């Protein structure tokens, strides 16, 4: 395998930590870095919008 010469193609899924509600966490969602409190939402996203 090789690193840092072409866009990523193949790799296995990463085991993730279970979601925690209503607690100060240092979240990292597929590239985002930030801090806050995660709760259930209400906004109706579009099918492709992330």
């Amino acid at each position: 395998f090789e690193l840092l010469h072409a866009p990523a193609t193949v790799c296995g899924p990463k085991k993730s930590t279970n979601l925690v509600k209503n607690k100060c966490v240092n979240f990292n969602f597929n590239g985002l870095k930030g801090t806050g409190v995660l709760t259930e939402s209400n906004k109706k996203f579009l099918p492709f919008q992330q």
């Binding site: 109706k44 996203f45 579009l46 919008q49």
Partner: protein, 50 residues
């Protein structure tokens, strides 16, 4: 069938509560569109603008 070409410009787009694009306005077509883009609004009151 129809073909058209693209060049880099700047647009002003209006979303809504659902999240869909409803209307858009150019910013380099007419002076009226220019001042609409400058004021960040779709309606302009009477007067002189820079």
């Amino acid at each position: 069938y129809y073909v058209g070409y693209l060049q880099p410009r700047t647009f002003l787009l209006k979303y809504n509560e659902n999240g869909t694009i409803t209307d858009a306005v150019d910013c380099a077509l007419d002076p009226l569109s220019e001042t609409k883009c400058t004021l960040k609004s779709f309606t302009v009151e009477k007067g002189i603008y820079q």
